[PDB]
Design a binder for this molecule. Structure first.
Ligand SMILES: NC(=O)C1=CN([C@@H]2O[C@H](COP(=O)(O)OP(=O)(O)OC[C@H]3O[C@@H](n4cnc5c(N)ncnc54)[C@H](OP(=O)(O)O)[C@@H]3O)[C@@H](O)[C@H]2O)C=CC1
Length: 301
């Protein structure tokens, strides 16, 4: 009997190597991906044992697809022990915003809003599971990110709104903004549900995984040289395998069962995890709650 874990965006990068590390630990991985062929080719190239994973379609940019995936997973009749919100898109140099089928700027829609709906639906499945060590793990972070007063969300977040704070569109900051929402969501998940469910709600920063397709929308020269830069200059480089293994630790290792925490190993890498409380910024306490409320409104809860 294999414990089940859902990993979004498992077809490459951190999610792919997290699938391999969890599979090697005896978990069964739900690879929730939007590109089924790309995901299947990725698992076979790594020779991940086929009995350790199953691939289901999930497009986080479509709220109907999120709801559809939840039904598809429930039809598996597999109790859920863990959910990893890993998928993301990064546009550093996108001039004009792209809007999802539901009408939302694609970076926030994919990175935050789709995950926000998935989390709220799958919370039922995590509650009902008989496992005692259940975890919800969110991939976080370490143009600075600024949500302002959530004016863009406060006003419905439809075009021409393209930023959470209502300011004009900046694709790179939109990514930073979306990962900030991931942290605040992990912070709200713990505050709202940990004492009453026993589920562990954590975020994690594995380091600079300079090799992943996250930089696919960057200049081709950037993708070629960023690993060497991160390796020989900043020292913040981490391999895809090490990042995947760190996700698996926070999901499965007993040393990481404390809830409401952000795990990291530093900006510059050595050769030991740091604990940071998610509610540390006490002045973001109300903005975190309103973000949650506005997100419930945007995804139709
Ligand atoms: N790379 C780094 O240095 C760091 C990364 N992170 C986080 O790591 C996580 C992994 O990203 P990484 O592995 O780096 O880059 P990848 O692009 O390799 O992982 C991105 C994943 O998200 C999936 N994805 C994107 N849009 C959607 C969508 N609409 N529906 C479903 N799946 C989607 C991609 O699938 P497709 O290929 O089909 O888009 C891919 O599987 C991200 O959350 C990122 O924020 C955090 C800190 C540092």
């Amino acid at each position: 009997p294999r414990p089940t874990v859902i990993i979004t965006g498992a077809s490459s990068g951190v999610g792919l190597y997290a699938t391999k590390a969890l599979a090697n630990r005896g978990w069964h991985v739900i690879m929730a991906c939007r590109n089924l062929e790309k995901a299947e080719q990725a698992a076979k190239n790594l020779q991940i044992p086929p009995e350790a994973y199953t691939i289901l379609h999930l497009d986080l940019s479509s709220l109907a697809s999120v709801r559809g995936f939840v039904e598809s997973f429930r039809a598996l009749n597999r109790p859920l022990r863990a959910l990893v919100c890993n998928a993301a898109v990064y546009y550093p140099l996108l001039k004009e915003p792209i809007y999802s089928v539901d009408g939302y700027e694609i970076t926030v829609a994919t990175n935050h809003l789709g995950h926000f709906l998935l989390i709220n639906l799958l919370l039922e499945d995590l509650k009902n599971s008989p496992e005692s060590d259940k975890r919800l793990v969110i991939l976080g972070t370490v143009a600075p990110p600024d949500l302002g007063n959530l004016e863009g969300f406060e006003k419905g977040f439809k075009k021409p709104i393209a930023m959470i704070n209502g300011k004009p569109f900046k694709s790179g900051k939109a990514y930073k903004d979306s990962k900030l929402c991931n942290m605040l969501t992990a912070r709200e998940l713990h505050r709202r549900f940990h004492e009453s469910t026993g589920i562990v709600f954590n975020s994690l920063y594995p380091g600079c995984v300079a090799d992943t397709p996250l930089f696919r929308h960057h200049f081709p020269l950037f993708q070629k040289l960023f690993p060497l830069f991160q390796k020989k200059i900043t020292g913040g480089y981490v391999s895809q395998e090490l990042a995947g293994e760190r996700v698996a630790m926070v999901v499965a290792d007993p040393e990481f069962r404390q809830s409401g925490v952000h795990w990291s190993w530093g900006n510059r890498q050595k050769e030991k995890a740091f604990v940071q409380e998610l509610s540390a910024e006490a002045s973001d306490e109300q903005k975190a709650r309103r973000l949650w409320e506005l997100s419930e409104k945007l995804v139709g809860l």
